[PDB]
Amino acid sequence: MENDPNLFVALYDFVASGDNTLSITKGEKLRVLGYNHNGEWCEAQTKNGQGWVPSAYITPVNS
């Protein structure tokens, strides 16, 4: 299916540290809204809130 280009899935569990990082779970869908300047951190929205998550733990859904 054709998904939103900013729809990502988590590759691993990530537990927030600590202020305005967002906690995520392996296989969870996320919507990425923004990047830091080199794209290694993502401002993401999930079923549980908004905040920062590492690119290394997520991947876009589309291919």
Short mmCIF file of N, CA, C and O in Angstrom, two decimals:
data_model
loop_
_atom_site.label_atom_id
_atom_site.label_comp_id
_atom_site.label_asym_id
_atom_site.label_seq_id
_atom_site.Cartn_x
_atom_site.Cartn_y
_atom_site.Cartn_z
N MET A 1 0.85 -1.23 0.00
CA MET A 1 0.00 0.00 0.00
C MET A 1 0.87 1.26 0.00
O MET A 1 1.98 1.23 0.53
N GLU A 2 0.37 2.35 -0.58
CA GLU A 2 1.09 3.61 -0.59
C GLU A 2 0.84 4.40 0.70
O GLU A 2 -0.26 4.89 0.93
N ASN A 3 1.88 4.52 1.53
CA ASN A 3 1.74 5.19 2.81
C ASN A 3 2.34 6.58 2.75
O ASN A 3 3.00 6.98 1.80
N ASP A 4 2.02 7.35 3.78
CA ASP A 4 2.57 8.69 3.90
C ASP A 4 4.11 8.60 3.91
O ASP A 4 4.69 7.77 4.59
N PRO A 5 4.83 9.48 3.19
CA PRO A 5 6.28 9.39 3.17
C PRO A 5 6.94 9.59 4.54
O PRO A 5 8.13 9.30 4.69
N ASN A 6 6.21 10.16 5.50
CA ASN A 6 6.76 10.37 6.84
C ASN A 6 6.25 9.35 7.83
O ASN A 6 6.43 9.52 9.04
N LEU A 7 5.67 8.25 7.35
CA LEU A 7 5.31 7.11 8.22
C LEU A 7 6.51 6.19 8.39
O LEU A 7 7.07 5.73 7.38
N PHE A 8 6.91 5.93 9.62
CA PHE A 8 8.09 5.13 9.96
C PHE A 8 7.61 4.00 10.88
O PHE A 8 6.54 4.07 11.49
N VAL A 9 8.43 2.98 11.04
CA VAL A 9 8.20 1.92 12.00
C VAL A 9 9.47 1.80 12.85
O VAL A 9 10.61 1.94 12.39
N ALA A 10 9.27 1.45 14.14
CA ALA A 10 10.38 1.24 15.02
C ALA A 10 11.03 -0.09 14.79
O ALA A 10 10.34 -1.12 14.70
N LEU A 11 12.34 -0.13 14.70
CA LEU A 11 13.14 -1.34 14.56
C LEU A 11 13.48 -1.97 15.92
O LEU A 11 13.80 -3.16 15.96
N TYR A 12 13.54 -1.15 16.97
CA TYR A 12 13.86 -1.61 18.31
C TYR A 12 13.03 -0.80 19.30
O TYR A 12 12.67 0.32 19.00
N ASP A 13 12.84 -1.34 20.51
CA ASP A 13 12.32 -0.55 21.63
C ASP A 13 13.29 0.62 21.94
O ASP A 13 14.50 0.42 21.87
N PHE A 14 12.78 1.81 22.23
CA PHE A 14 13.64 2.91 22.64
C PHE A 14 12.97 3.46 23.89
O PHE A 14 11.83 3.89 23.82
N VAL A 15 13.70 3.49 25.01
CA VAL A 15 13.17 4.10 26.23
C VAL A 15 13.74 5.50 26.45
O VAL A 15 14.95 5.71 26.48
N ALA A 16 12.83 6.46 26.58
CA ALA A 16 13.18 7.87 26.58
C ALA A 16 14.17 8.21 27.68
O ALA A 16 13.99 7.77 28.82
N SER A 17 15.16 9.04 27.35
CA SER A 17 15.95 9.78 28.34
C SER A 17 16.10 11.23 27.90
O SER A 17 16.79 11.51 26.93
N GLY A 18 15.43 12.17 28.55
CA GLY A 18 14.36 11.92 29.51
C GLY A 18 13.30 12.97 29.25
O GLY A 18 12.12 12.66 29.16
N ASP A 19 13.73 14.23 29.09
CA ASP A 19 12.78 15.32 28.86
C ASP A 19 12.51 15.51 27.37
O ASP A 19 13.42 15.80 26.60
N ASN A 20 11.26 15.30 26.96
CA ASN A 20 10.86 15.45 25.56
C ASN A 20 11.55 14.54 24.54
O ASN A 20 11.65 14.83 23.34
N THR A 21 12.05 13.42 25.04
CA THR A 21 12.28 12.26 24.17
C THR A 21 10.99 11.49 24.22
O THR A 21 10.24 11.59 25.20
N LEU A 22 10.70 10.76 23.16
CA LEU A 22 9.45 10.03 23.12
C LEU A 22 9.80 8.56 23.23
O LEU A 22 10.70 8.06 22.54
N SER A 23 9.06 7.85 24.07
CA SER A 23 9.28 6.42 24.21
C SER A 23 8.57 5.64 23.08
O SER A 23 7.40 5.93 22.79
N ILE A 24 9.28 4.67 22.46
CA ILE A 24 8.71 3.80 21.39
C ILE A 24 8.92 2.29 21.53
O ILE A 24 9.80 1.75 22.18
N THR A 25 8.09 1.53 20.82
CA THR A 25 8.17 0.11 20.89
C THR A 25 8.49 -0.65 19.52
O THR A 25 7.94 -0.27 18.52
N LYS A 26 9.31 -1.69 19.46
CA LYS A 26 9.59 -2.40 18.18
C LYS A 26 8.28 -2.72 17.45
O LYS A 26 7.30 -3.24 18.03
N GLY A 27 8.19 -2.26 16.20
CA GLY A 27 7.03 -2.52 15.34
C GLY A 27 5.99 -1.42 15.39
O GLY A 27 5.02 -1.38 14.59
N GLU A 28 6.17 -0.47 16.30
CA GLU A 28 5.27 0.64 16.41
C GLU A 28 5.39 1.60 15.24
O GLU A 28 6.51 1.79 14.72
N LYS A 29 4.26 2.11 14.80
CA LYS A 29 4.22 3.11 13.76
C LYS A 29 4.41 4.49 14.37
O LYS A 29 3.94 4.78 15.49
N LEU A 30 5.12 5.31 13.67
CA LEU A 30 5.35 6.67 14.07
C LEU A 30 5.23 7.62 12.89
O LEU A 30 5.52 7.28 11.83
N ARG A 31 4.91 8.85 13.17
CA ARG A 31 4.85 9.85 12.15
C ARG A 31 6.00 10.83 12.43
O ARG A 31 6.03 11.46 13.51
N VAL A 32 6.94 11.03 11.53
CA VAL A 32 8.04 11.91 11.72
C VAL A 32 7.67 13.29 11.22
O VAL A 32 7.19 13.47 10.11
N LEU A 33 7.83 14.29 12.08
CA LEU A 33 7.48 15.67 11.73
C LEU A 33 8.64 16.57 11.38
O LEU A 33 8.53 17.55 10.67
N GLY A 34 9.79 16.21 11.91
CA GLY A 34 10.98 17.05 11.83
C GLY A 34 12.23 16.27 12.08
O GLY A 34 12.20 15.18 12.70
N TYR A 35 13.33 16.89 11.64
CA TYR A 35 14.66 16.33 11.92
C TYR A 35 15.53 17.35 12.67
O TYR A 35 15.30 18.57 12.51
N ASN A 36 16.55 16.90 13.40
CA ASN A 36 17.66 17.78 13.72
C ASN A 36 18.48 18.00 12.46
O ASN A 36 18.17 17.47 11.37
N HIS A 37 19.48 18.86 12.52
CA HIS A 37 20.14 19.28 11.28
C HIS A 37 20.79 18.13 10.46
O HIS A 37 20.89 18.24 9.22
N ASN A 38 21.24 17.05 11.11
CA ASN A 38 21.83 15.95 10.34
C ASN A 38 20.91 14.74 10.26
O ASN A 38 21.33 13.70 9.79
N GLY A 39 19.64 14.88 10.62
CA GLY A 39 18.72 13.76 10.49
C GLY A 39 18.93 12.57 11.38
O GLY A 39 18.21 11.58 11.25
N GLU A 40 19.82 12.65 12.37
CA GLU A 40 20.02 11.49 13.25
C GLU A 40 18.99 11.40 14.36
O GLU A 40 18.85 10.38 15.03
N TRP A 41 18.36 12.53 14.65
CA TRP A 41 17.23 12.60 15.59
C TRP A 41 15.99 13.09 14.87
O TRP A 41 16.06 14.02 14.05
N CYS A 42 14.84 12.53 15.26
CA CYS A 42 13.55 12.78 14.62
C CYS A 42 12.56 13.21 15.68
O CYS A 42 12.46 12.59 16.74
N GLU A 43 11.84 14.26 15.33
CA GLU A 43 10.67 14.68 16.13
C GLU A 43 9.51 13.84 15.62
O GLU A 43 9.13 13.99 14.46
N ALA A 44 9.00 12.98 16.50
CA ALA A 44 8.06 11.96 16.04
C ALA A 44 6.75 12.04 16.84
O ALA A 44 6.76 12.54 17.99
N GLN A 45 5.63 11.66 16.24
CA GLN A 45 4.37 11.47 16.95
C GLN A 45 4.01 9.98 16.94
O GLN A 45 4.09 9.34 15.88
N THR A 46 3.58 9.39 18.06
CA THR A 46 3.07 8.00 18.18
C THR A 46 1.74 7.98 18.90
O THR A 46 1.28 9.05 19.29
N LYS A 47 1.24 6.77 19.17
CA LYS A 47 0.01 6.60 19.95
C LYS A 47 0.12 7.15 21.38
O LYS A 47 -0.91 7.35 22.06
N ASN A 48 1.35 7.42 21.82
CA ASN A 48 1.59 7.93 23.18
C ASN A 48 2.07 9.37 23.38
O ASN A 48 2.17 9.83 24.52
N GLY A 49 2.34 10.12 22.32
CA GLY A 49 2.73 11.51 22.44
C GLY A 49 3.70 11.93 21.35
O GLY A 49 3.74 11.24 20.34
N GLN A 50 4.39 13.07 21.52
CA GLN A 50 5.37 13.67 20.60
C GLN A 50 6.69 13.91 21.28
O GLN A 50 6.72 14.39 22.42
N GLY A 51 7.79 13.71 20.56
CA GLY A 51 9.12 13.97 21.09
C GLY A 51 10.19 13.31 20.25
O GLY A 51 9.92 12.80 19.15
N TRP A 52 11.43 13.39 20.69
CA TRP A 52 12.59 12.99 19.89
C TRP A 52 12.91 11.51 19.98
O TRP A 52 12.86 10.92 21.04
N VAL A 53 13.28 10.90 18.85
CA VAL A 53 13.67 9.50 18.76
C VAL A 53 14.83 9.42 17.78
O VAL A 53 14.90 10.22 16.85
N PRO A 54 15.77 8.49 17.98
CA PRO A 54 16.90 8.36 17.04
C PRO A 54 16.60 7.69 15.69
O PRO A 54 15.95 6.60 15.66
N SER A 55 17.01 8.29 14.59
CA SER A 55 16.88 7.63 13.29
C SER A 55 17.37 6.19 13.27
O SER A 55 16.87 5.34 12.54
N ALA A 56 18.43 5.89 14.02
CA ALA A 56 19.03 4.56 13.97
C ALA A 56 18.07 3.48 14.47
O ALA A 56 18.33 2.28 14.26
N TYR A 57 17.01 3.87 15.18
CA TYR A 57 16.05 2.93 15.72
C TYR A 57 14.79 2.82 14.90
O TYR A 57 13.90 2.07 15.29
N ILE A 58 14.69 3.56 13.79
CA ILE A 58 13.42 3.58 13.02
C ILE A 58 13.74 3.45 11.53
O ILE A 58 14.87 3.67 11.14
N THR A 59 12.71 3.21 10.73
CA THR A 59 12.93 3.16 9.29
C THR A 59 11.63 3.59 8.62
O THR A 59 10.55 3.30 9.16
N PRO A 60 11.70 4.23 7.45
CA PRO A 60 10.46 4.54 6.75
C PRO A 60 9.70 3.28 6.35
O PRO A 60 10.35 2.28 6.03
N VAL A 61 8.38 3.31 6.39
CA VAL A 61 7.57 2.20 5.93
C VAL A 61 7.64 2.01 4.42
O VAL A 61 7.79 0.87 3.97
N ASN A 62 7.63 3.10 3.65
CA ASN A 62 7.58 2.94 2.19
C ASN A 62 8.81 2.28 1.61
O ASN A 62 9.91 2.51 2.11
N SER A 63 8.57 1.49 0.56
CA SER A 63 9.56 1.08 -0.44
C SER A 63 8.90 0.87 -1.81
O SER A 63 9.65 0.84 -2.77
#
